[PDB]
Design an enzyme around this catalytic site. Structure first.
Site, short mmCIF file in Angstrom:
data_model
loop_
_atom_site.label_atom_id
_atom_site.label_comp_id
_atom_site.label_asym_id
_atom_site.label_seq_id
_atom_site.Cartn_x
_atom_site.Cartn_y
_atom_site.Cartn_z
N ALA A 45 -41.69 38.68 -8.67
CA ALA A 45 -41.08 37.84 -9.69
C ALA A 45 -42.00 37.60 -10.89
O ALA A 45 -41.52 37.11 -11.92
CB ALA A 45 -40.67 36.49 -9.10
N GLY A 56 -41.46 32.17 -4.35
CA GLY A 56 -41.42 31.01 -3.48
C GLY A 56 -40.47 29.93 -3.96
O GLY A 56 -40.03 29.10 -3.15
N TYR A 111 -58.82 30.12 2.46
CA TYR A 111 -57.39 29.98 2.71
C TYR A 111 -57.08 30.02 4.20
O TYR A 111 -56.15 29.35 4.67
CB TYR A 111 -56.61 31.08 1.98
N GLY A 147 -45.15 29.65 -7.06
CA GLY A 147 -44.76 31.04 -7.20
C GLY A 147 -43.29 31.19 -7.58
O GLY A 147 -42.44 30.38 -7.22
N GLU A 200 -33.49 13.89 16.11
CA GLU A 200 -34.02 12.54 16.18
C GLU A 200 -35.02 12.26 15.06
O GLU A 200 -35.22 11.10 14.68
CB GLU A 200 -34.68 12.30 17.54
N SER A 203 -43.78 28.29 -1.39
CA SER A 203 -44.61 27.55 -2.33
C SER A 203 -43.83 27.29 -3.61
O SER A 203 -43.00 28.10 -4.03
CB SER A 203 -45.90 28.31 -2.65
N1 LIG Z 1 -52.76 27.12 1.56
C1 LIG Z 1 -52.52 28.34 1.09
N2 LIG Z 1 -51.87 28.49 -0.12
C2 LIG Z 1 -51.62 29.74 -0.61
C3 LIG Z 1 -52.02 30.86 0.11
N3 LIG Z 1 -51.65 31.95 -0.60
C4 LIG Z 1 -51.04 31.55 -1.73
N4 LIG Z 1 -51.02 30.18 -1.75
C5 LIG Z 1 -50.43 29.35 -2.82
O1 LIG Z 1 -49.59 30.17 -3.60
C6 LIG Z 1 -49.90 30.10 -4.98
C7 LIG Z 1 -49.84 31.50 -5.57
O2 LIG Z 1 -48.51 31.90 -5.81
P1 LIG Z 1 -47.52 32.33 -4.62
O3 LIG Z 1 -47.00 31.14 -3.85
O4 LIG Z 1 -48.22 33.31 -3.70
O5 LIG Z 1 -46.32 33.08 -5.39
P2 LIG Z 1 -45.26 33.98 -4.59
O6 LIG Z 1 -44.61 33.19 -3.48
O7 LIG Z 1 -45.93 35.22 -4.05
O8 LIG Z 1 -44.18 34.37 -5.71
P3 LIG Z 1 -44.60 35.29 -6.97
O9 LIG Z 1 -45.86 34.74 -7.60
O10 LIG Z 1 -43.49 35.31 -7.99
O11 LIG Z 1 -44.85 36.69 -6.47
C8 LIG Z 1 -51.30 29.50 -5.07
O12 LIG Z 1 -51.36 28.56 -6.11
C9 LIG Z 1 -51.53 28.83 -3.73
O13 LIG Z 1 -51.43 27.43 -3.87
C10 LIG Z 1 -52.67 30.71 1.32
O14 LIG Z 1 -53.03 31.70 1.96
N5 LIG Z 1 -52.92 29.44 1.81
#
Ligand SMILES: Nc1nc2c(ncn2[C@@H]2O[C@H](COP(=O)(O)OP(=O)(O)OP(=O)(O)O)[C@@H](O)[C@H]2O)c(=O)[nH]1
Ligand SMILES: C/C(=C\c1csc(C)n1)[C@@H]1C[C@@H]2O[C@]2(C)CCC[C@H](C)[C@H](O)[C@@H](C)C(=O)C(C)(C)[C@@H](O)CC(=O)O1
Ligand SMILES: C/C(=C\c1csc(C)n1)[C@@H]1C[C@@H]2O[C@]2(C)CCC[C@H](C)[C@H](O)[C@@H](C)C(=O)C(C)(C)[C@@H](O)CC(=O)O1
Ligand SMILES: Nc1nc2c(ncn2[C@@H]2O[C@H](COP(=O)(O)OP(=O)(O)OP(=O)(O)O)[C@@H](O)[C@H]2O)c(=O)[nH]1
Ligand SMILES: Nc1nc2c(ncn2[C@@H]2O[C@H](COP(=O)(O)OP(=O)(O)O)[C@@H](O)[C@H]2O)c(=O)[nH]1
Ligand SMILES: Nc1nc2c(ncn2[C@@H]2O[C@H](COP(=O)(O)OP(=O)(O)O)[C@@H](O)[C@H]2O)c(=O)[nH]1
Ligand SMILES: [Mg+2]
Ligand SMILES: [Mg+2]
Ligand SMILES: [Mg+2]
Ligand SMILES: [Mg+2]
Lengths: 428, 439, 428, 439
Positions: free
Chosen positions: B99, B146, B224, B143, B254, B140
């Site tokens: 994306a 996400g 991570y 992203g 519940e 997330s």
């Molecule tokens: N706690 C944790 N957070 C992660 C990890 N990998 C990615 N993130 C979170 O994800 C964000 C990066 O973007 P993504 O969530 O990976 O984006 P995506 O879901 O791949 O969607 P696109 O960016 O459009 O491809 C970072 O700011 C992190 O906060 C991980 O291994 N552990």
């Protein structure tokens, strides 16, 4: 002659009921397999009241287990004295109530009430002359509080002449494990006062206090609390199972207990209760047991008897004691506590004596008391209900099951009427 | 009889799912290849693994999980590493283009290309499912995939079933730590699915976990992997009741009965304790009273917000190990006596107790130390409203200058959609404040 | 999966492009003949992005060499890693441009643009899912600036949905080996600002300064300067070739870099860069690399970023490092240099981490900055253009090829508008 | 592919051409007989000698040069010298009678009678080549043949092709030293044809070369042969990039576009450095900066005019040998800082840098010493107008008395053309100063 059908509903009812049958089996000398290993003839004289004779010399109880989840049945079946029950009597759901009263009465309770009514009807015709039914459940839960209430109403219509006994616990003032407890308690109370002949209120907080000061135990357990409740149940119906000089069945007690149909709330109690280090310094005499009955910390309810007045007191004695002694101590207690007894009732003490003592004890007795101090327990429940119903908190879950908002108001009004009736008798 | 389905979407979801399933196999004694040594690993099997693992053939256990991502780089590592044989190949679905941190691309352009395939896999698992309790989704907010693909996925699930509770596990953006420029835009646009479709959303913050590891776990430079392990423990404790046996068990239904006073208030926070190293374990005692007090402190929370500023509305406590009911009742009384902690007046009883028997499991080569007790805290408080304010301020400044807007517009978005999402965010914050007002 | 088509135009592009493929081949472990001799499976996993597989385990680059003279091609063919390229990819002219933009775009390019359009078109159907095109050319020349610009428009019309990259050099303020540098540079910016998504500016004067002070090299060489450019090229697209904890392709970087379509000019940077003597004294930590990245001496452009506010900053990390350390370093840099960054954007830093480190280095990072100080470079070109256009100097040479006077004025006006928009937001 | 044609006309052109071709053969290794030895054996000579020579049969090379003159005595020396076998008999064209220092004799009386054979020879050479970069013509202004025949031949070349550059190497009459009485007449009459046709003409003065050889080379009395040896070096260095490889290469088509800002201003000068003897080489350290300073020195210039009086408009810098780009950039920077050298205001950048790998080749027996570096300077300046002013003044004095005018009139000239030539010459001087006017 007389037969009693046992019904267990909810997680709390199943656990308490399981311990109750173990005590009964020990009294009647029944091994977990189902045979008789006793050494007396009186044990089998009145075994038909609770146990049904089977092929060879096996006996099965008239107990039906009702729940909306299969977890409780698995623990009971795999536990001690679990294979002695009839496999067909095990009726369980699969979704569960989720501590919601509305789920077990209108939404999912109706899908299993028909199944459990078939079994109880089959058991009813077996008894030559049935006397009544006893139910164990919890008013704070979702399954026992909801499904148990529905079963009471359904059973009452089929047999409007049999006695109704409910050993239901109520939410504690301080100890609380569920957020929606006030909603469940108020709804179930609305039906108990109109369909149950007599109720027994048990508080978990009171049970903990007994095991902390009287029993002097360090780490109480849920099994310990269930044992105290089971002991009370045996004392109530000991005259039907064993002979005695002065016996009183369930109907005889009910006539002398309730002066009015709406005043049928009692507080249970058992004596004696001593620690393991106080056995040597304790005397097993009638004076000692009588004093423990009229005691605040020996009661299994959070309500304090000294706050109100005793309406009617019924005590059952087990063992071999002279009738002269038991006819004097209760008169002395009534005279000394004349301020704690009602005026328009001349005699407020009912005395019943049974010959057979319990297992391991020379003498024992149970205390059952009707007092106006029980109105305090319902007063706190009403206050909690109003606070949560003011903001309509946690109401969409109940509304979505099919009930109406006006139903909550009706339940609150009836409970407020119940304490009002208790107020007028004590004050006047 | 009771089973659940876990969904992982995006790069973040896949990594969390890899750590979560690593602990799940260890708890049930399942080898990574797929054979469970039932000769030595003696267990019931009625609900120990049937809830999450479905038996197939002879001696094979496959997780009931779907791995979805728009880029093949993240998923290819799973299909190559140690746990390649654990997952059914058809359950891992890959795309061709990501994306690129664009909500529109993952929701209007690329999401529609593979939406049919992912729905078929869920339906196939549902057919084998006798009774399904709910769905768990990991993603997330920052992203594009996400936030875009997840929003489109939940809208299909709500229409398809419409009667199963769905749980949300999302990573909230940190206040001062960020890895992208367009994070505020994605966070605001993804609030629609988290307010109408999701029945309960669990939010964690990367910044808060970093501080916890530095101070409690004595890890100077956590990665991570360490962060995902702590998150995995939260999910395991929540679903422990459905998988094991205990004196008091709380299921998914519940959870929402006592933690959702109002339909539009379903954003609680999670807290885990105790978290200590092996060095401090030998010099301290982990009593029931001690662990309960550590959960209520603001330093041990998994979110960067301050709970003392807000007020608590509904609380849920989950106990694991040799926890006795007597100790819990005494501990609860002490909490209610402290004047620092405040509770709403309309809720007199707001505590739920769930006691399990299985002790916590420690993954070899990890950071957590072996303990006999553990408490999982889920509390719904009004202090969450402060988190919304920080994200709203960033969005207003960026949208004023119309920065990076043309990227979203060219992919199928409209300028009016951004304004509509702003009103919803403000309304949600207002509702939280209104409930907290004393009567 | 994702592949990139590379185009080389002009003498400068051919020499820089030849060195670029040497770095890529070394990273992927490809011998000059074309056989894989690597020791890791990750090298061949994503080798299709830059190399096309052939028979007998042979690979050919997806690169096209375009020039109007055969001298440059002969040196490249006879040089190291020359036989690796496909012979059919060698398309060259015979007349030459003679440092004239008009001849390359109008007189001489038109005859050869069709031939080179066949080769670039043919690679696309073989490509599974193309991502974009990268072209290397010199703005100060006549072939790359003239004909290479025309190739940008042709590709844009055929593929209006793919990103366009141009790693191009710009005329230096003091260094100048040609008389008509401002004329060619001005006429190329007009087309680049319309048919390009991201442009990287390289200054020869800045490269010499880095090789003099930062690297402490005695004598510089054109190959040494080309090595720095190739190193930056590899670090931009390291995510597309190797996995990492946080991945970001060219499109992901592009959207976070350009706030507006017209503002798409960036300045590159690489770190670390130390001399041989100081290699044993410096440490390898994240803060050490961050300091060099945000230093004016390490910038690859003549513009000093300290005279303007940074709009957006892109940083890609290579190697094994903790995410906590890199998160704080960029946040601290923005917090300390608050006046050096834009205000209406809260965060101006994009972080990317690649697991695979570069050859002979534990950690490395590439710096990309969209600073507002790039308008100074265009300002000095405008002054030179106006001075020569006032006297109509050398205009007849451009006019004789078919150009018009009004066309020169349009390019000057567009360039003036470009520096106005950059200054408008900086001074907003 | 890259090919050029050299034409020598007049006694001076042949004499210079003989010295130039000797230098060209030695730079490639071709023996005077025309056979390439095994040292080179046509190895890597695709453009090394193809630009100048052509391959015929095996072990034989012929230059692509045409020798045309009106007297046979000069041509006889070439046919009798050692290089007779190298040249082709038909290429060397002789004549019956010379022009006798008369512009009309080489234009009308004799020019058209023999020009027919010259045109066919050029056409034959043109067909053999594939791509013709341009033409090279060598002549002298003072000579009648170098002014009459050259003017007629140049006009015919433009009629035929009209699309190839035609560079001109001419010797301008000295301000004081002269050996004829009609030099002003011949010199003025040929100005129009050079400006009209030739795109770039390089002007040299015999007096300047005499001083350079006398002082820099330490020669008591320079000869004409020594002068021609120097002239070949600029021509070799000019075309060095076409035949030899290098870092930065400048072709024959880049000289015009980088030197002339306007079509009329196409008269640059030439300067060669370093020029020292073997004895001075041992005591002098040649450097890139040192040679650049010598080129800008008016003493070392090949034109008697003083560049400091005028201004520089366009400058070219060709480097041969071990020359690095870094040293050149520093050297040119210091030149701009110097106040003495003045640049045109509207020309901000006027430096062109070209580097060739091939070092200079020293012919045995020559006064030039072996030096690893050499710089060729092609600069266009307004100071060249002074040299034209001197000859114009002499012509006015002679034309006022009309001395020897009847000699030109008898062969076909008219007094109108002489007046027109003065007007055309005066316009060129006026335009030179007009462009030099600042803002
Ligand atoms: N706690 C944790 N957070 C992660 C990890 N990998 C990615 N993130 C979170 O994800 C964000 C990066 O973007 P993504 O969530 O990976 O984006 P995506 O879901 O791949 O969607 P696109 O960016 O459009 O491809 C970072 O700011 C992190 O906060 C991980 O291994 N552990
Ligand atoms: C036998 C007896 C008391 C006694 C005898 S003579 C005298 C005076 N008092 C009681 C049992 C009693 O029948 C109940 C009511 C049975 C009640 C069971 C009690 C309350 C406890 O829960 C029970 C599990 C115990 O902790 C044990 C270990 C059995 C005992 O300590 C309880 C204990 O004191 O045992
Ligand atoms: C490994 C290293 C630096 C380093 C290691 S630990 C630390 C701190 N810094 C770099 C190599 C690095 O590959 C580039 C980008 C080196 C890029 C190549 C550079 C620009 C030169 O062209 C090259 C010929 C050089 O002059 C040399 C001397 C060989 C340099 O590469 C020296 C040298 O080793 O420099
Ligand atoms: N550099 C150089 N110049 C020469 C040489 N010989 C003659 N010249 C020049 O030529 C002039 C003499 O006249 P030429 O040019 O030979 O006359 P021409 O071209 O033969 O024409 P005509 O005299 O009419 O036959 C002198 O002024 C010299 O400048 C020479 O050997 N070297
Ligand atoms: N004394 C006693 N109380 C119990 C036992 N089991 C449950 N309870 C009480 O019952 C309450 C929970 O009721 P619950 O089991 O959820 O009712 P259900 O919804 O019908 O299953 C708790 O507050 C306990 O105090 C038991 O074995 N003994
Ligand atoms: N970095 C770098 N710059 C170069 C190289 N070769 C030439 N240049 C620069 O490019 C400019 C000339 O461009 P040119 O090659 O003539 O462009 P073209 O005419 O299109 O081929 C000069 O000013 C040089 O500074 C090289 O190998 N590397
Ligand atoms: Mg329960
Ligand atoms: Mg992604
Ligand atoms: Mg070039
Ligand atoms: Mg002559």
């Amino acid at each position: 002659m007389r037969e009693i059908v046992h019904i267990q509903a909810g997680q709390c009812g199943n656990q308490i009921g399981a311990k109750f049958w173990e005590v009964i089996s020990d009294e009647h000398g029944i091994d977990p397999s189902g045979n008789y290993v006793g050494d007396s003839d009186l044990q089998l004289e009145r075994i038909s009241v609770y146990y049904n004779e089977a092929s060879s010399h096996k006996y099965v109880p008239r107990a039906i287990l009702v729940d909306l989840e299969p977890g409780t049945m698995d623990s009971v079946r795999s536990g001690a004295f679990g294979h002695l029950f009839r496999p067909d009597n095990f009726i369980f759901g699969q979704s569960g109530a989720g501590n919601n009263w509305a789920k077990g009465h209108y939404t999912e309770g109706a899908e299993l009430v028909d199944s459990v009514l078939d079994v109880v009807r089959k058991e009813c015709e077996n008894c030559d002359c049935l006397q009544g039914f006893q139910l164990t459940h919890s008013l704070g839960g979702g399954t026992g509080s909801g499904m148990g209430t529905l079963l009471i109403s359904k059973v009452r219509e089929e047999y409007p002449d049999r006695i109704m006994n409910t050993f239901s616990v109520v939410p504690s003032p301080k100890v609380s494990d569920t957020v929606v407890e006030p909603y469940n308690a108020t709804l179930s109370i609305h039906q108990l006062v109109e369909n149950t002949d007599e109720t027994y209120c048990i508080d978990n907080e009171a049970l903990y206090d007994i095991c902390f000061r009287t029993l002097k135990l360090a780490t109480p357990t849920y099994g310990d609390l269930n044992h105290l409740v089971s002991a009370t149940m045996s004392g109530v119906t000991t005259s039907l199972r064993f002979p005695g000089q002065l016996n009183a069945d369930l109907r005889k007690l009910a006539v002398n207990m309730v002066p009015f149909p709406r005043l049928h709330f009692f507080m249970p109690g058992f004596a004696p209760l001593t620690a393991r280090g106080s056995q040597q310094y304790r005397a097993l005499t009638v004076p000692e047991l009588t004093q423990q009955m009229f005691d605040a910390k020996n009661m299994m309810a959070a309500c304090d008897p000294r706050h109100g007045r005793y309406l009617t007191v019924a005590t059952v004695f087990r063992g071999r004691m002279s009738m002269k002694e038991v006819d004097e101590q209760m008169l002395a207690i009534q005279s000394k506590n004349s301020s704690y007894f009602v005026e328009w009732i001349p005699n407020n003490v009912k005395v019943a004596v049974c010959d057979i003592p319990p297992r391991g004890l020379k003498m024992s007795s149970t205390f059952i008391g009707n007092s106006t101090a029980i109105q305090e327990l319902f007063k706190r429940i009403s206050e909690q209900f109003t606070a949560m119903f003011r903001r309509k908190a946690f109401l969409h879950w109940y509304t979505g099951e099919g009930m109406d908002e006006m139903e909550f108001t009706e339940a609150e009004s009836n409970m407020n009427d119940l304490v009002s009736e208790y107020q007028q008798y004590q004050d006047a | 009889m009771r089973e659940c389905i876990s969904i992982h979407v995006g790069q973040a979801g896949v990594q969390i799912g890899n750590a979560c399933w690593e602990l799940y196999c260890l708890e049930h004694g399942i080898q990574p290849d797929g054979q469970m040594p039932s000769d030595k690993t003696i267990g019931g099997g009625d609900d120990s693994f049937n809830t999450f693992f479905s038996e197939t053939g002879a001696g094979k256990h496959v997780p009931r999980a779907v791995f979805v991502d728009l880029e093949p780089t993240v998923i290819d590592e799973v299909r190559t590493g140690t746990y390649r044989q654990l997952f059914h190949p058809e359950q891992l679905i890959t795309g061709k283009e990501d994306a690129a941190n664009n909500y529109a691309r993952g929701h209007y352009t690329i999401g529609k290309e593979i939406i049919d395939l992912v729905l078929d896999r869920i339906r196939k698992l549902a057919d084998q499912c006798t009774g399904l309790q709910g769905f768990l989704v990991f993603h997330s907010f920052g992203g594009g995939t996400g936030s875009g693909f997840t929003s489109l996925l939940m809208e299909r699930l709500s229409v398809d079933y419409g009667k199963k509770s769905k749980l949300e596990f999302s990573i909230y953006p940190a206040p001062q730590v960020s890895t992208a420029v367009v994070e505020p835009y994605n966070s605001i646009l993804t609030t629609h699915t988290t307010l109408e479709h999701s029945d309960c959303a669990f939010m964690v913050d990367n910044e808060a976990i970093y501080d916890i590891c530095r101070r409690n776990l004595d890890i100077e430079r956590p990665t991570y992997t360490n962060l995902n392990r702590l998150i995995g423990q939260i999910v395991s404790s929540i679903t422990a009741s459905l998988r094991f046996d205990g004196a008091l068990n709380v299921d998914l239904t519940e959870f929402q009965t006592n933690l959702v006073p109002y339909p539009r208030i379903h954003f609680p926070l999670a807290t885990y304790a105790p978290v200590i190293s092996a060095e401090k374990a030998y010099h301290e005692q982990l009593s029931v009273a001690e662990i309960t007090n550590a959960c209520f402190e603001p330093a041990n929370q998994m979110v960067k917000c301050d709970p003392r500023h807000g007020k608590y509305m509904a609380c849920c406590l989950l106990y694991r190990g040799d926890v006795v009911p007597k100790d819990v009742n005494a501990a609860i009384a002490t909490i209610k006596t402290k004047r620092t902690i405040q509770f709403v007046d309309w809720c007199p009883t707001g505590f739920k107790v769930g006691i399990n028997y299985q002790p916590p499991t420690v993954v070899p080569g990890g950071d957590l130390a072996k303990v006999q007790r553990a408490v999982c805290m889920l509390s719904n408080t009004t202090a969450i409203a402060e988190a919304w304010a920080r994200l709203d301020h960033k969005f207003d400044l960026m949208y004023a200058k119309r920065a990076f807007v043309h990227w979203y517009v060219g992919e199928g978005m409209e300028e009016g959609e951004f304004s509509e999402a702003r009103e919803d965010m403000a309304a949600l914050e207002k509702d939280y404040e209104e409930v907290g007002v004393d009567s």
